[PDB]
Each structure stands twice: as structure tokens, then as C-alpha cells.
Design a protein around this ligand. Structure first.
Ligand code: ATP
Ligand code: ATP
Lengths: 141, 311, 140
């Protein structure tokens, strides 16, 4: 609320809720200003999250329920922790939750975009996942 | 009959005006007006008490809405001048400022008095010849050193921490006990103006928290601004404040200070080590009980007469 | 904006426009207020845009000494300047009361609430700042 009061943050008041956002340029500024602290932040919140709720435990009843499915892979990828990204996404539990809370299109998009992010063996596996995901999307939703 | 002159001047204010959201303290407005007339054109000291942000000017604003009351007392106008806590050099700088205030058009020399004795003389001459029959109001009087230069048995209105200040000065004393408070519906009127809801449109929790706080306007104002932004959950700030309210934890506020200690420390620190501890030692008593004097002898290790005087 | 400015109805209020240097903050106001009759009856004595910027205490004092001069363009009063903030408050009040009543002083680039402390007097004030939320720290 203070950030908003200082023009540092924009607030879409969704009735009783407050969905906060930045404009495009407002994000671009810090994107350049911040360095390696960002990867540390990425790695930090991964451990911290797990110290509290597991990403698979993470039920749709939460507020941040879809948050972590929309962004955790992004965090690991940004962090360049391909070993953690592999461990996260190569999982039928992770897929199950993400597709029941968020949906399979974003997922597929990631398995594609992350082909240049992952390691050689990992890419070969991820390609199995790229074909795997074609199986579903029938029953999903 | 409020003259048209006042009807226009109130827009600027010679004195501070009433709030945007208020309840007229009907119990005090009429009685204060009736007590002000007891001067009958004779000298006296009228003192209003309270701290910054607790409605000290708010009281006066509604109480003195009657023009004819003071129409014949101060034809030359009423001026509200902030004084505050000043030391000797601050009183001197304030006296140099007061000289300038009486010559707004610079008709006399731009030079300032050099000492207190000279300032006394210059102010007297200007109030005698150019500004006779007018009221100078001293806002926030804290030190008797300042009052030493004003104790001259004249019609003086001032604001301070305690109405008892009238005892240190000479002349007929008039004070306000402020025996009035706002109730439920009055607090609901305050709310209605803040959120523009009818009191009937307000949730049950808004009525419940009034039953808990008994409708105090200082609490209603804060909570309204808090729940303006925060989802309307009275429970949040209610149970929170029961833990150690926002008088304990300073928050953003329109009030000059969010801690009581800020203003209070002026009167507490201006004391002596033994009775400064005694002041703080009073908190061991389970409120809210009216206790006779004897009970504090053991606590202070003081003799009955010693306890009585300190109290 | 024209329709919202008329909501003052001759009563006090705080109008705040927000943005940063070079992002069209003055550009917005320039087109929005092209209607004269809107403010014709609000400020007959004129509108003055005065740059304030980020000032510390001594900067506010120097700015107050400058403001005193601004109200006496023809040097009809003493060339001497106020010595402190309390005096400056008084001098400005007298000149705005008697010589420049019914006019608008616009404070460009407000950054610090220390400055606003000397202006929060429930008057018709237009100012520019980083965030429109500034109106919450003042009354009216
Ligand atoms: N009768 C009342 N009805 C509604 N609100 C009240 C009443 N009395 C006090 N208040 C509230 O208390 C606040 C106190 O106002 P203010 O800040 O003017 O107090 P103060 O003691 O006069 O301080 P200062 O004199 O420096 O302004 C008001 O803004 C209002 O929120
Ligand atoms: N509606 C508009 N149409 C066209 N150009 C615009 C518009 N709004 C902003 N601009 C552009 O943004 C620039 C901002 O102007 P300017 O430098 O006056 O902004 P500022 O925020 O008012 O800064 P300052 O107030 O110190 O001048 C303009 O010169 C123009 O290039």
C-alpha cells in the first residue's frame, strides 16, 4: 500500500482484493538495475517456499495457488538452475497439479521454450514430455 | 447576527475552523457561550486544554459559533498565533515575530526589538494605538517562563495541556471541563460522513465496535480511514488494538503525533526524578478505580501529606 | 478534468497532478484546462506556476525568502527578506490577503512532506508531484 502511495506499484482493486502490477516500462527499469541478486532471489524463494508449503501440496484453495505454477519454473529458469528446473518439471505430479489449476497450453509452451535452457539429456527427456502432453488436453478442462 | 464581515473572513480563518466530519458538542456549545459572557467586558483568563490531534481546536470551533457573544468584546478581531514549547531565545525570536505581525503593511521601521523589555514596549504601543480591543490567542502554552511576560490581568484566551494554567496568572479564571462525549448515533453520523453510507447501511461490526469503544470520535476517525483501504474487517484492527493499540505503535496519522509520549513528555520531564518515577509508578493499579490517597503511601514511601501534595 | 474542477464550487480543495520531468505532466494540464470560464470565477487574481523541486529545510527557507519578493514585483515594500519560516508565513499571508487575494499559487514538483507542513491550511491548492496520493497528507 505504501509502494502504491509512492507511485512504485499499481493496484487493480478487484473488489475486496488488491491485485498489484507494474507497467511494462516500470518492470524494465529494475530488470536492468538489478543483477545477480535476482538469481539469488529466485533460488531463495524456492527453498523458502518448500520450507512452508510444497508446490504439490499447493492446493487451489490458496491465493498464490496458480502463482507458483505460472512462475516457479520461470524462477528456476531465470536462476539458470537447470538441475532444479529438471527436477521440477520432469514430474507427473507437477504436471497434474499445473494442468488442473492452470492448464496445459502454458506448460507445453514451456517445454518448448526451455529446450534451449536444459542440458542435452534433459532436452531429450523434455522432448518425451513434449509428445507426452499431446495425450492429454482431451480430458483436461 | 453574525455580521457579513465574519461570514466572509471565516473562509480564511483568523482562528482554526471545525472539521469536515463533526458532531456538534451540543452539551458544551451553549454552556461555554454562557460562561464566556461572564467576563462582562472585564479582564479574565480563558483556558482550553488538550493535545495536538485530540480535538482541542475542534471544541472551540463549534462552541463559539455565536458572534454577538464576542462582538462587543473584541471589535478589533481575533488572531490565533502558534507559540509552542519555546526556551528563552525562542521567546525572544517569537517577540520579534510578534512585532512584525502588528505591522503587516510595513508602515513603521523594518527593524526588530533587541530584547524582551523593548519588545514588551513595542507590542504595548501597537496594541494600544493600532490594535486596541482585540484578542491574541496563544496556542500551545507549555512553560510558565513565557507566561511571565503576559500575566498582566488582561482578557487572554490560550490553549495548553491543562486548564489549571489559569491559577499561575491573575484575573478572573474561566475553564472548560469538557463534560461531553459522543455516543452511538453521533459516532454513526461521523462514520456516515466518512464513508457516505447511511448508518443503516453499516454493517453490524461497525455498530459492535461502537459498543466496544463507546463512540469516541478520535477512534472512529482512525478506524474509518483504516478500513477505507483495508477490507472492511473491524475485527482485524479491533483485536489488533486490544493487543497494544496504535497509540502504542506509531502509524501514519493526520495527528501531529501518534504517540502520547511526545507531548506528554514535556510535562513529565519538566519535573523531578522522584515524582517522575512516581508518575510512572501509578500504572500498577488495576483500572479503572478511584482510589483514595492513603493507598499510595506504601508505593512512594511517602508520608500522607507528601503523597497528597504530589498527587 | 474540467467537470471535476468545477466540483470545488468555490470551496477549498487540493488538486494534484502527478508525473515526472519529461513525461508530459504539464502537457496534460495545458489541454485539460483550456476552458477559461471554468476557473474565471475561482481565481480572478491570476494563476502563477512556481517551481519548487526537492528542497531541504534551508532550501524551504530560501524559497520562502524568494516567494516574499515574488509578491512585490515593483518593490513597493522593503527590499529586506524574512529571517525565518514563521515570519515568512506571516509576510506571505498579509500580501496574499491584501494584495493578491483570490489567486492561485501552483507548487511544481513537490517531493517532501516537510514542505507541505507549511501549506496544509485547507485552501484551494493546485500542485504537481510524483503521486496523486499526496492529497491524503493534507486536509480539504
Ligand atoms: N466532536 C467531534 N466530532 C467529530 N470528530 C471529532 C470531534 N472532536 C474531535 N474530532 C476528531 O479529532 C480530530 C482532531 O482535530 P485536530 O487535528 O484539529 O485537533 P487539535 O487538537 O485541534 O490539533 P490542532 O489544534 O493542532 O489541529 C479531528 O480531525 C476529528 O478527526
Ligand atoms: N498528448 C501528447 N501528445 C503529444 N506529445 C506528448 C503528449 N503528452 C506528452 N507528450 C510528449 O512528452 C513531452 C513532455 O513534455 P515536457 O518536457 O513538458 O513534460 P513535463 O512532464 O511537463 O516536464 P516539465 O513539466 O518540466 O516540462 C512533450 O514534449 C512531448 O514530446
Amino acid at each position: 500500500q505504501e509502494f502504491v502511495n509512492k507511485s512504485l506499484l499499481f493496484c487493480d482493486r478487484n473488489g475486496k482484493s488488491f491485485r498489484y502490477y507494474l507497467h511494462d516500462l516500470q518492470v524494465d527499469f529494475l530488470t536492468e538495475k538489478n543483477c545477480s541478486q535476482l538469481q539469488d532471489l529466485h533460488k531463495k524463494i524456492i527453498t523458502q517456499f518448500q520450507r512452508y508449503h510444497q508446490p504439490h501440496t499447493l492446493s487451489p484453495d490458496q491465493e498464490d495457488c496458480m502463482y507458483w505454477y505460472n512462475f516457479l519454473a520461470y524462477h528456476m529458469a531465470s536462476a539458470k538452475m537447470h538441475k532444479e528446473l529438471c527436477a521440477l518439471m520432469f514430474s507427473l505430479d507437477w504436471i497434474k497439479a499445473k494442468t488442473e489449476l492452470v492448464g496445459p497450453a502454458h506448460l507445453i509452451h514451456e517445454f518448448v521454450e526451455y529446450r534451449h535452457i536444459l542440458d542435452e539429456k534433459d532436452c531429450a527427456v523434455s522432448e518425451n514430455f513434449q509428445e507426452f502432453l499431446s495425450l492429454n488436453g482431451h480430458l483436461l478442462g | 447576527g453574525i455580521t457579513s464581515y465574519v461570514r466572509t473572513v471565516l473562509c480564511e480563518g483568523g482562528v482554526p475552523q471545525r472539521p469536515v466530519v463533526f458532531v456538534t458538542r451540543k452539551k458544551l456549545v451553549n454552556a461555554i457561550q454562557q460562561k464566556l459572557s461572564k467576563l462582562k467586558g472585564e479582564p479574565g483568563w480563558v483556558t482550553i486544554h488538550g493535545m495536538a490531534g485530540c480535538g482541542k481546536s475542534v471544541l472551540a470551533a463549534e462552541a463559539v459559533r455565536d458572534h454577538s457573544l464576542l462582538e462587543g468584546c473584541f471589535p478589533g478581531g481575533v488572531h490565533w498565533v502558534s507559540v509552542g514549547k519555546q526556551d528563552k531565545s525562542g521567546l525572544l525570536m517569537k517577540l520579534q515575530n510578534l512585532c512584525t505581525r502588528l505591522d503587516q503593511d510595513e508602515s513603521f521601521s523594518q527593524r526588530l526589538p533587541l530584547n524582551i523589555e523593548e519588545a514588551k514596549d513595542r507590542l504595548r504601543i501597537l496594541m494600544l494605538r493600532k490594535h486596541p480591543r482585540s484578542l491574541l490567542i496563544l496556542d500551545d502554552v507549555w512553560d510558565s517562563w513565557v507566561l511571565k511576560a503576559f500575566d498582566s490581568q488582561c482578557q487572554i484566551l490560550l490553549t495548553t495541556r491543562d486548564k489549571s494554567v489559569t491559577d499561575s496568572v491573575m484575573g478572573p479564571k474561566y475553564v472548560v471541563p469538557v463534560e461531553s462525549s459522543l455516543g452511538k448515533e453521533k459516532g454513526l453520523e461521523i462514520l456516515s460522513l466518512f464513508v457516505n453510507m447511511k448508518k443503516a447501511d453499516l454493517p453490524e461490526q461497525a455498530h459492535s465496535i461502537i459498543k466496544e469503544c463507546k463512540g469516541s470520535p478520535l477512534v472512529v476517525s482512525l478506524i474509518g480511514a483504516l478500513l477505507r483501504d483495508f477490507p472492511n474487517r473491524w475485527e482485524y484492527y479491533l483485536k489488533q488494538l486490544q493487543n497494544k493499540q496504535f497509540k502504542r505503535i506509531r502509524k501514519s496519522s493526520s495527528y501531529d503525533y501518534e504517540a502520547l509520549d511526545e507531548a506528554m513528555s514535556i510535562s513529565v520531564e519538566m519535573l523531578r526524578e522522584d515524582i517522575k518515577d512516581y508518575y510512572t509508578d501509578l500504572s500498577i493499579l488495576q483500572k479503572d478505580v478511584k482510589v483514595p490517597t492513603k493507598v499510595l503511601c506504601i508505593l512512594w514511601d511517602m508520608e500522607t501529606e507528601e503523597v497528597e501534595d504530589i498527587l
